[PDB]
Design a binder for these strands. Structure first.
Lengths: 86, 53, 63, 84
RNA sequence: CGGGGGGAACCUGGGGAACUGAAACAUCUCAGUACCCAGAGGAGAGGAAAGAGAAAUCGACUCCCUGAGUAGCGGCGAGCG
RNA sequence: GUGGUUCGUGGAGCCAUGGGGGAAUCUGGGCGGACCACCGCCUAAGGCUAAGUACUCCGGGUGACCGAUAGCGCACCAGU
RNA sequence: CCGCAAGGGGUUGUGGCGUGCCUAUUGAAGCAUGAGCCGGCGACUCACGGUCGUGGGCGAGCUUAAGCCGUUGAGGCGGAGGCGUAGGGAAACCGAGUCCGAACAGGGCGCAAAGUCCGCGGCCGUGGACCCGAAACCGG
RNA sequence: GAGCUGGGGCUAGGAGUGAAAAGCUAACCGAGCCCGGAGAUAGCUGGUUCUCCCCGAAAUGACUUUAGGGUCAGCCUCAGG
RNA sequence: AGGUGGAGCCUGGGAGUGAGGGCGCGAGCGAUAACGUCCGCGUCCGAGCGCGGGAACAACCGAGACCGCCAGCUAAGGCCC
RNA sequence: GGGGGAUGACCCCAGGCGGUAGGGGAGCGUUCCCGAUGCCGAUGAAGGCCGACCCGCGAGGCGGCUGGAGGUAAGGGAAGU
RNA sequence: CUUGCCCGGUGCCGGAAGGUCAAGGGGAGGGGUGCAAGCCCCGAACCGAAGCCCCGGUGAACGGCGGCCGUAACUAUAACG
RNA sequence: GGACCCGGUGAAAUUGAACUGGCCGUGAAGAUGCGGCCUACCCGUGGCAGGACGAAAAGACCCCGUGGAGCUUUACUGCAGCCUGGUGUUGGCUCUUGGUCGCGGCGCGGCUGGGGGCCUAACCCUCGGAUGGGGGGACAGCGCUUGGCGGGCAGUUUGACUGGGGCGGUCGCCUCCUAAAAGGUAACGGAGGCGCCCAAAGGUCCCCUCAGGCGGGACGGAAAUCCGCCGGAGAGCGCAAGGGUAGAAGGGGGCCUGACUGCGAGGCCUGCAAGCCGAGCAGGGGCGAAAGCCGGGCCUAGUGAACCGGUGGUCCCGUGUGGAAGGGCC
């Protein structure tokens, strides 16, 4: 009443990472960028990454959310010109 | 839970009476009859809190 | 003549004039779940759509 | 959550504006200085607030909501059943 | 003096089942059904309450509608109700 | 220890009983659902009782019922 | 041969382009099965519920069972009930508000849009219930 | 001769008998036959009718004692905004 | 932005198949073997996507079958019989 | 779908129209119940037998021969179609 | 002619002193209502049956009845180890 | 002796229909009927078997229906029978030891338990010649509950995958690769981890700067321990991988436990349920002077519906009212 060996055979299961909302769309106080949950969002867009430059999301409200390192936590604000006096 | 007399043993802790309790998992592993910390029973707020059960 | 899984009608169930129906959250709790707290703050009421049709119906009439 | 048999008690659904109005047609009886208690639509008189009391009237019934009973005072009375 | 033998269907008692549903099947269901037995009648069944329920309210038994697919029974499942 | 009851062992009563103990004659004695106080009901452990509902072998009536492979299978020396 | 005449009938000599017919099938002429031929039987129905749509009678709408009236036999009275008339909640109970709670953060709802009875239908449940099909179990 | 036999009977069919293979039990008993549950259930198999108009399918995904079923999705169609 | 033009979105009733293959391509396995299977991107067939072609051949190249027998241009493919 | 429809219909052009499960709309005959101020037939009910008018159609009408007695509904209803 | 070897498990036969354990007796004690006598339960220390546990006997009772290394063996188990 | 020719009689399964040739090719891959071609008059009777996938029979061999029926054992359960405690119509007489509470003990006391005896009037049997005798006898038959054995029988069951059924494997969840570059996809395709744990890897406030290599000296000659240089961090992080990433999660020390209740705007993935994130609002703390962080961990695995029940809190229900059994809510 056990299990065997020499049959590696070991399928893998599912995930579901994304950039949801990609860069520069109607910004809604909701899941910003994703690739590491428990995540700790940030302020506006993010531009820090194992790449160099940065990314703007011409979309501004409360805040977004990170992914733990990847992407690059937000902080470089950027409400967007669409955040002035009505 | 999965009651496993394996250094894995579930317990709680009163609120000096603050009245009832609050959730907690544990491990004899170390410090046996050891278990204290504060909270806040329906009883006002705070209150010393032994855990033993 | 008709009745209804009176059951489910008992447990989880019961509609609003809205023509909709709901039953208490229903995450985990109330079995195994030393788990956590905030998770606790995880039992109000969960309203599943589509299917809530068998349901409602099958119940139909009194509820 | 259900019981091991029957038991139960009682009470009904009767409310404000409701009356004032359809009770406006209740004027075919005690709809003058109005000693309500129809007798037309319901069972076990209760008074729902919402609306705006009126037709100045004393009501021989079970009870009613907050405002209601209030509004009541707006321009009318309030009598309760049996013993209260 | 009466019986006993009948008799399509219907009647109460005596005894009394699997299929099948539950998408298995042991609980459950079909049911107290189908069948067999006894026996009364032209109808038997039943029938003036150590009843019902609770407004100090109701009152024979029966049957039709309604109560109600409600109160409720349950591997709270199919259903029964 | 079973029954019936909506009750499938249940907080589970009433009535009915398979075995064993085996009370009272009106301040008696069951009952209103474990039990208990108080209230309220009823008076058993014998009997008779038409009428209101069920069923068609029989006779009649009527048919958005049939017409000879339909209707009862069998319209006439057929349960032969 | 022209009882519907200058247009058609019937039969074919040639040539010209052509794989039958049904079920189940990725796919079928079939060599997969179904059927020899003709005539008649023979298969999505009824009831109670519920469910949407529609034809229409009043918006509070609507009727049990029965009482009476009945060539034809003529319907008419019957108001226990039941769905709507707020709902929200395990409940107490409150109530156009309510439950969680001790907090003005959400769930259900308010906001009338109001049905209701019936008729006729596409359906859904109980039904033997689209129609026949077996090996078996159980009673006498 | 545990011989063949006529005539008379006894047992019986979830039960008989059986010098015993599961044999024989009114010509196919691995549990007889008729009537009854009953038109048992039957993801399987077939079978499934007169014309015509309009558009136009899937043969994937998710969970199943579920894999040749079916729930929910995805792709059809009609009514209104 | 939109030349488009006719798909789109929500509510709601009625569904069916819930297992397909064939071809090109990019991958998996496989003896880079099979009209092998296994996932993907487009097409393809769907018992009529019926006709042309490639002899014949769903199916690969072209084609979208309302109907008009004794019209006209072409496709792909052809023009010694 | 849209430009005016008088009830028809007529004109443009847009615009397709191959289609099994399967979805929506429209029509056809079958035996019956109306006889919504309806009745034909011995110089034939009806079925039969045969056909070069009417309809996309499933059917109609109508004329010739047969055969002994019925039944048709101009319109709505029903169903063992 | 001759049926040998094993009762660790199993069936059985015997044992019954000891553990266990049902209904049950039999009381500590708690509980509900109780103005109170009372009036219902839960009740446990100990005594308590076969059975099972434990001791033995049991094979024409079920059943089972070893493995490899070395050694005279000019070569091979073997006489031995 | 049929078969053959005559006269008399005169069936039968199967069959859509048919005037049914060979070829080599083809199609669903073994064709008279489709293509090209070659032989080819119309019919018959006596024959000979090859093809018409000929006839017989909706394969018995196969798998599939969470079909059926028979036998088997340490399959599941249950009954028949058998053993068995207490109880009953199963009455007397005596011999006895045990418990117990009261007043190791003994004396007594109520209590009650074990047991040994002919009898005997039930009961049964007995008979043997009649109803009386005889024999057993409190038995037992036999009734009720207990418990036990119990395939003797009765009823069900004994999964899926499966590039044929079986044997073999294998089914959840975490990562890589496969996925063709958004997301995401089979394969019994590749390889590898998990059904833990840590009370201190918890919360903050305060400090640290890795592996390694080289050069110099104790106990030291791999491999420390210190001292001096070099360093897109290649070390470091409890556990598998992969992302991360020293600025640090990562290494110490200070107090501290929010490893919070009431909630959560608003999103990720999603047919379901789940799964997962999260500012900010309030009560109440902790850490810092404070600007702020704290609703366990660096993450993504450490898993489970709803019912069936336990228990600590409620004081919501409590089936005539007062309550409690019991129930709902946490």
């Amino acid at each position: 009443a056990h299990k065997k060996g020499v049959g590696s055979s070991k399928n893998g299961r599912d995930s579901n990472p994304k950039y949801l909302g990609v860069k520069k769309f109607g910004g809604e106080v909701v899941k910003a960028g994703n690739i590491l949950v428990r995540q700790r969002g940030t302020k506006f867009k993010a531009g820090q990454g194992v790449g160099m430059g940065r990314d703007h999301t011409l979309f501004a409200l409360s805040d977004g959310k990170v992914v733990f390192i990847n992407k690059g936590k937000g902080a470089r604000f950027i409400s967007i010109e669409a955040a002035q006096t009505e | 839970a999965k009651d496993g007399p394996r250094i894995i043993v579930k317990m709680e802790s009163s609120a000096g009476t603050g009245f009832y309790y609050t959730t907690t998992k544990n491990r004899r592993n170390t410090q046996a009859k050891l278990e204290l910390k504060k909270y806040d029973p329906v009883a006002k707020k705070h209150v010393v809190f032994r855990e033993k059960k | 003549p008709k009745m209804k899984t009176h059951k489910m009608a008992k447990r989880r169930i019961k509609i609003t004039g809205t023509g909709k129906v709901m039953a208490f959250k229903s995450g985990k709790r109330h079995q195994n779940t030393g788990k956590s707290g905030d998770e606790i703050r995880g039992k109000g009421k969960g309203f599943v759509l589509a299917k809530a049709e068998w349901a409602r119906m099958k119940l139909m009439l009194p509820r | 959550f259900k019981r091991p048999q029957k038991v139960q008690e009682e009470a009904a659904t009767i409310d404000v504006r409701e009356i004032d109005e359809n009770v406006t047609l209740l004027a075919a009886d005690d709809v003058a200085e109005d000693v309500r208690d129809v007798a037309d639509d319901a069972d076990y008189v209760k008074v729902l607030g919402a609306g705006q009391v009126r037709h100045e009237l004393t009501l021989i019934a079970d009870d009613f909501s907050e405002g209601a009973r209030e509004k009541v005072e707006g321009a009318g009375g309030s009598v309760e059943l049996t013993d209260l």
